[PDB]
Design a protein around this ligand. Structure first.
Ligand SMILES: Cn1nc(C(F)(F)F)cc1C(=O)Nc1ccc(S(=O)(=O)N2CCCCC2)cc1
Ligand SMILES: [Zn+2]
Ligand SMILES: [Zn+2]
Lengths: 1275, 41, 28, 95
């Protein structure tokens, strides 16, 4: 139980009851007011009783220490969260951060030595691409002194403090919660220069020397402060070293300093203003509208709410409101359009509010207990559109016919003859005579998709406790009685993989028969949701096992069946409407959904199935449960006798968000279409994330002004909005005018903010998240340095600067290595690696500049700056290393050490499941290994009938044997082996074991039950120590491969590397089909301006991409049907190839996949001739001609050797990084030539039609007929 | 002479049919367990 | 019959536009 | 119409929204002179005054003209005159 480190990043909510409980048990005074005094009263009565355990004793001792130290300070005052935010953001100590300061000073003195060469190596790449001969003299200074910029920031000392405290408390928690030693020493204050710390295991006490203020914090608050400050430091550095954000820096700094000044005064309600910067960033983008009547429409509501919050809080004065409004005006008002979605990235950096259960239960009870008055005529007019959509969706795909479809009763003439003639009908007829669909009875014409996969059940979910024990979540401390013990399990996978008799039809009948309404164990509970900036905000609901299974089954049915029917001179002009769907699922009563659930009952043939949710909720009780907010109950009572009070919501009517999402989404389109018909406009809806948009569209004459076109296209939707609002209010829904936007230009979605063909992306959202330790279960430097480099590459595509992001990655990697070496809580870091590595400075930067596919710890190579996917990691990392050695960042001997390093020990299955892996010693991820071990164990030991007969303990040996048979030939093909093994029944098992997302609790349970041995525990408890030892050996080793030089191509280097790396499985046999030349080394460039003649063109090359851009002010505006797992057999048999004899083996494996004969297989496979842009703003102006680039190796009837899109992505990249700082595209039209040269990169190969299988084919004794495994009865 | 009122009677019946499907209760078996039992046994 | 036809059609005319009142509590 | 029938979930469970004559809780009509999601119409409130000020500030006029329009706004009182000045400014902006 020691391979689990405490949490490093924030993942839970900040509950004020938690701090109140800790302090009230530690007997410390505190100025914390609670909405419900039930927790305090319970703890008080429990103390008067005499209950106490080890936690109470430890907290009492820490409280005694605190109360004894508080005597030296006469006027101490507890400053509660969030009132202490302005102080604790700028706290700084000089005698407590004495260690991390020296650590980071050394980490900065190393970068100060490598930075001149880093800049030289980036300037080489720039000049080679053809952007001049010298970087900007500003970029040079920033790249070189990037460490001094990061160190002379206002958040650096708070960062050091909140990292020291975080790691110290993490070490305390880790070394304490382990049951090895129990005798504990009391923790004493650490008197620093300006503050005094007490880092206990539960709470931290910070006293301020000069101010006398006192703060008490918990682990969640420490994690949140560390996260906030590590985000602010990274974003401020990334906006300081950058020039495009020169105007945004002042606005963001003023926003920080202005909203920090409200925390001491306003308090917790300050997040109701912090959470007003997402709507304001759109209300201030509407002020650039083209229909002046709309400017201010949303801003009026935003300012009204910002005034109401101040008034209710108490700041009734007008001066404060006026200064606040002027400040917000200055902050948000700007000129550049692409810098309007940036303030979106920063509204999560003020911290998260402290929330309780009462104030989040009342907010949902208010909406779920509320009468409504729907209107039958419009309800049926929407139901008519529903029936019409179903009619058309079945008449299509079936050649215009209604064989099992509707049977009207008194239908009109046209709508009765449409069925006879077998023709469809548009919205017009349905809304015109909706009386014809007033009694239509369908008939079952939709099969039940049953054994697709196990996604729904396997995906980790929580379960509520059985209704008979609903208060087992509350520990015995905070309760006024002894709660009943918890028998059942508390996870969907833990109750699913133990189901001795599971049946989806058993569940469907558990709903149909109607036993879910008499089940004496059903229970629904609410749980507060972490990392939200609204005190009420959202909760997530947990329900019992059988009901959750029926819910996921119903949703899968309604998403796989009719849910797919609803997917979809004069010019067209479209406006946009955007409204959020929060609090939009509580206005869904049974009356307004029965007419749509009934047609689906009659379509799927499931009597009274699809309306289970409301029939079950309307007679149940749902409480909001968190362990620290107990109910006020002197004795245990059933969930039916609790009154309607703080945490309970008795007998709701509305829905629950997430459940019946497809049902509500397909039942909400009929009213959009009715309101569109009633106005004569064509609409298109899109629910993306948490807010739905509607693109109302109308046809207008072409010879019209753009202004008048957009004005009329906005008028039509200003008319449509009121119609739609009336319709939704008649069916029962409130389409509020405050929380909604109408605009002729933009609409929000989940990839940024679309604005009139552009995309105002937010580039500083991932820089604020490239924090030190990555999300994992054990602190591992490899995963940390991979998450550090996987976010800079995302900021680069969202808009950041390539060179500055690369330098930021290098610096953060260099100091992450040092933090993991000499500032870690790990106990296996020994002086045989810590001391030599920390002492040798050159080696420590060599290991941080060496790429990861080679053996180093640098995961961002200079080709990932430009292209999205690099060709081959091993042949691109060697090109990167050659570039570094040339620019003199690393010595020449590093290449020889790389090429003669120590080969690891990996089998054939690992090479088949990772085909680009030049095998390395101790490189894999401990988290991934523990997942792939525990998932396999728990799937092998499971009596579940759904996956039985598939996970036998010999599956590992069978997988290794199949991989050996596939790979071992006279010519090795790892990519084809990977494809075959992935599509086979040995890849299906791994896909299921990956879908089975194991949690920290599940791995804890596995260790408790003995899932893995103590030998595996000791092998994976000291992994990173072996990473550092292997790196030391790699960089110290003094060998030489006389046949290695800097001039040999990177392709040849990677081939030699793989051959020498595993000749033990190759013995000289050629590995084939992996190496593809590096794009940045293979492609040179040149920029033709107004009057000049190309030079690298006339030097001889005739193969080059040609890009063009004109001059104009822009950058502001302008036997085989319904396929199944048989597809797996087909793609496998094509990946195998066309063989005279080995077609038998291909048929054998495809038969083990699916049941089919050799002749049908050969006639179904498509035998081939062989044997084997939404991110930038200057791509609109750009014109690309691929003619001259068409020259490839013989340009025969094959695929492009290099990925043809690379020579275009790398041209758009350079054009964007040229026009990155310009407002116009110049005065003269510019051209770009992108010559390529892959001469020595061509593999001299022998075209083998196919290789003879030099190993005997041994498979499973008999292909199991498990229907989840690829089907064995297609026809 | 008679069909013109039979259509009206059928319209009233069809209204009362789908008016007591969107209102729980109002009978012995007034809800909608009237679909084809199942495509598969 | 000539009068009963309209006397019964007015019933459908009035019933084709009604208001359904949904309560606040599922049990009451 | 004063004549609209009402049928409830049960017989006697409709006493909630029967008194709200006053039968259905209707919605507030979006008028051309009431501020809503469509169009802007300024009231006398500080919210509306500050919104007009923000329109003057974020407009694309010249700085002296923006300040002059701000001075014009400083001495305007009453919802009616405020709406007239708003119409005037909206007419001026696109000129
Ligand atoms: C009735 N209605 N009218 C409109 C119109 F047209 F005005 F936009 C929209 C709706 C409507 O939102 N239905 C609906 C759709 C999904 C859900 S959800 O629970 O799955 N949800 C929770 C919140 C996050 C997203 C997922 C709940 C209700
Ligand atoms: Zn080459
Ligand atoms: Zn050229």
């Amino acid at each position: 139980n020691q391979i689990l480190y405490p949490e490093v990043h924030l993942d839970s909510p900040i509950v004020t009851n938690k701090i109140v409980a800790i302090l009230e048990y530690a007997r410390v005074p505190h100025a914390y007011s609670l909405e419900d005094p039930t927790l305090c009263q319970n703890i008080k009565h429990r103390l008067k009783n005499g209950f106490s355990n080890q936690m109470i004793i430890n907290n009492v001792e820490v409280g005694n220490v605190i109360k004894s130290k508080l005597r030296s300070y006469p006027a101490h005052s507890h400053i509660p969260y969030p009132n202490c935010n302005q102080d604790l953001f700028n706290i700084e100590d000089k005698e407590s951060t004495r260690k991390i300061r020296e650590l980071l000073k050394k980490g900065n003195s190393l970068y100060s030595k490598v930075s001149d060469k880093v800049f030289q190596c980036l300037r080489d790449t720039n000049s080679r691409l053809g952007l001049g001969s010298e970087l900007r003299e500003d970029i040079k200074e920033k790249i070189i002194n990037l460490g001094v910029y990061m160190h002379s920031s206002q958040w650096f000392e708070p960062f050091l403090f909140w990292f020291t405290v975080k790691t110290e408390m993490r070490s305390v928690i880790k070394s304490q919660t382990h049951t090895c030693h129990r005798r504990r020493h009391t923790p004493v204050f650490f008197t620093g220069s300006s503050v005094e710390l007490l880092i206990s295991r539960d709470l931290v006490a910070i006293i301020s020397k000069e101010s006398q203020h006192v703060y008490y914090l918990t682990f969640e608050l420490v994690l949140m402060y560390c996260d906030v400050i590590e985000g602010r430091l990274m974003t401020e550095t990334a906006m300081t070293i950058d020039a495009r954000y020169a105007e945004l820096l002042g606005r963001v700094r003023y926003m920080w300093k202005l909203i920090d000044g409200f925390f001491p005064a306003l308090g917790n309600p300050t997040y109701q203003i912090v959470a007003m910067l997402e709507p304001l960033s759109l209300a201030y983008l509407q002020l650039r509208d083209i229909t002046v009547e709309l400017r201010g429409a949303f801003l009026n509501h935003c300012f009204t709410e910002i005034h109401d919050v101040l008034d209710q809080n108490g700041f009734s004065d007008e001066g404060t409101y006026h200064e606040l409004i002027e400040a917000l005006d200055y902050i948000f008002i700007t000129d550049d359009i692409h810098l309007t979605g940036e303030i979106f990235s920063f509204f999560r950096s003020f911290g998260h509010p402290r929330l309780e259960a009462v104030t989040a239960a009342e907010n949902v009870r208010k909406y779920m207990n509320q009468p409504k008055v729907i209107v039958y005529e419009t309800l049926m007019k929407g139901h008519a559109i529903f029936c019409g959509i179903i009619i058309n969706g079945y008449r299509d795909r079936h050649g215009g016919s209604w064989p099992p479809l509707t049977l009207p009763l008194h239908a009109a003439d046209t709508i009765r003859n449409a069925q006879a003639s077998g023709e469809g009908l548009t919205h017009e007829q349905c809304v015109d005579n909706w009386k014809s669909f007033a009694g239509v009875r369908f008939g079952c014409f939709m099969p039940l998709s049953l054994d697709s996969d196990l996604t729904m059940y396997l995906k980790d979910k929580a379960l509520a406790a059985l209704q008979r024990e609903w208060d087992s979540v509350y520990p015995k401390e905070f309760l006024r009685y002894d709660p009943p013990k918890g028998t059942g399990s508390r996870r969907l996978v833990d109750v699913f993989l133990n189901d001795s008799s599971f049946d989806p039809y058993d569940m469907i009948m558990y709903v149909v028969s109607g036993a879910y309404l008499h089940d004496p164990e059903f229970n629904l509970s609410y749980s507060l949701k972490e990392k939200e900036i609204k005190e009420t905000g959202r909760l997530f609901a947990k329900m019992t096992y059988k009901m959750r299974a029926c819910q996921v089954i119903a949703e899968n049915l309604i998403s796989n069946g009719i849910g797919k029917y609803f997917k979809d001179t004069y010019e067209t002009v479209s406006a946009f409407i955007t409204t959020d769907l929060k609090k939009y699922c509580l206005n869904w009563r049974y009356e307004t959904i029965s007419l749509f659930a009934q047609r689906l009952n009659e379509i799927y043939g499931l009597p009274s199935f699809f309306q289970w949710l409301h029939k079950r909720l309307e007679t149940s009780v749902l409480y909001v449960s968190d362990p620290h907010c107990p109910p006020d109950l002197d004795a245990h009572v059933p969930l039916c006798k609790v009154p309607n009070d703080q945490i309970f919501i008795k007998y709701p009517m509305g829905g629950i968000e997430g459940y019946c999402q497809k049902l509500w989404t397909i039942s909400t389109i009929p009213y959009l279409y009715l309101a569109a018909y009633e106005s004569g406009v064509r609409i298109a809806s899109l629910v993306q994330g948490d807010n739905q948009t509607i693109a109302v569209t109308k046809r207008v004459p072409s010879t019209w002004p753009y202004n008048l076109k957009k004005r009329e296209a906005a008028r039509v939707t200003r008319d449509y909005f009121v119609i739609l609002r009336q319709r939704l209010h008649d069916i029962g829904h409130h389409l509020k005018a405050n929380e909604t936007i109408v605009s002729s230009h933009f609409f929000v979605y989940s990839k940024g903010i679309y604005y009139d063909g552009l995309l105002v992306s937010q580039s500083l959202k991932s820089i604020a998240r490239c924090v030190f330790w990555s999300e994992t279960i054990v602190d591992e430097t490899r995963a940390a340095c991979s998450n550090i480099a996987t976010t800079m590459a995302k900021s680069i595509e969202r808009g950041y600067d390539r060179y500055l992001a690369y330098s930021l990655n290098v610096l953060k990697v260099i100091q992450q290595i040092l933090i993991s070496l000499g500032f870690t809580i790990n106990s296996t870091m020994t002086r045989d690696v810590v001391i030599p590595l920390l002492t040798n400075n050159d080696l420590l930067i060599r290991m941080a500049l060496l790429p990861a596919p080679i053996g180093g710890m640098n995961y961002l190579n200079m080709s990932r700056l430009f292209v999205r996917n690099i060709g081959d990691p091993v042949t691109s990392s060697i090109a990167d290393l050659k570039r570094m050695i040339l620019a003199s960042l690393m010595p020449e001997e590093t290449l020889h050490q790389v090429m003669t390093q120590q080969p690891g020990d990996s089998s054939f299955l690992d090479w088949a499941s990772d085909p680009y892996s030049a095998n390395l010693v101790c490189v894999q991820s401990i988290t991934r290994l523990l997942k792939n071990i525990t998932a396999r164990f728990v799937l092998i030991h499971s009596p579940n009938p759904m996956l039985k007969g598939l996970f036998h303990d010999d599956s590992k040996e069978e997988d290794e044997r199949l991989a050996a048979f596939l790979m071992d030939r006279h010519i090795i093909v790892p990519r084809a082996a990977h494809e075959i093994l992935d599509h086979s029944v040995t890849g299906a098992r791994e896909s299921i074991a990956g879908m089975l997302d194991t949690t920290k609790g599940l791995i804890r349970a596995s260790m408790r039950k003995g899932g893995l041995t103590s030998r595996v525990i000791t092998r994976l408890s000291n992994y990173d120590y072996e990473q550092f030892r292997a790196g030391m050996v790699l960089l110290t080793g003094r060998k030489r491969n006389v046949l290695i030089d800097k001039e040999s191509c990177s392709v040849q280097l990677a081939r030699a590397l793989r051959s020498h790396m595993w000749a033990r499985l190759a013995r000289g046999r050629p590995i084939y089909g992996l190496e593809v030349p590096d794009v940045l080394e293979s492609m040179r460039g040149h920029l033709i301006r107004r009057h000049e003649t190309c030079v690298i063109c006339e030097c001889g090359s005739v193969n080059y991409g040609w890009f063009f851009v004109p001059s104009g002010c822009q950058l502001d505006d302008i036997s085989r049907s319904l396929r199944s797992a048989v597809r797996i057999a087909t793609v496998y048999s094509w990946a195998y190839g066309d063989d005279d004899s080995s077609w038998n083996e291909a048929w054998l494996l495809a038969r083990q996949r699916a049941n089919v004969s050799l002749e049908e297989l050969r006639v179904i496979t498509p035998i081939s001739t062989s044997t084997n842009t939404s991110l930038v703003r200057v791509a609109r102006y750009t014109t690309i001609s691929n003619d001259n680039l068409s020259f490839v190796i013989s340009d025969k009837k094959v695929d492009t050797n290099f990925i043809y899109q690379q020579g275009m992505l790398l041209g758009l990249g350079v054009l964007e990084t040229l026009f990155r700082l310009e407002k116009d595209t110049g005065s003269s039209n510019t051209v770009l030539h992108l010559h390529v040269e892959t001469d020595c990169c061509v593999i001299p190969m022998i075209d083998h039609p196919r290789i003879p299988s030099s190993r005997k084919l041994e498979l499973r004794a008999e292909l199991c007929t498990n229907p989840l495994i690829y089907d064995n009865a297609p026809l | 002479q008679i069909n013109r009122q039979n259509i009206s009677i059928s319209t009233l019946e069809g209204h009362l049919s789908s008016i007591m499907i969107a209102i729980p209760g109002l009978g012995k078996d007034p809800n909608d367990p009237t679909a084809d039992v199942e495509l598969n046994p």
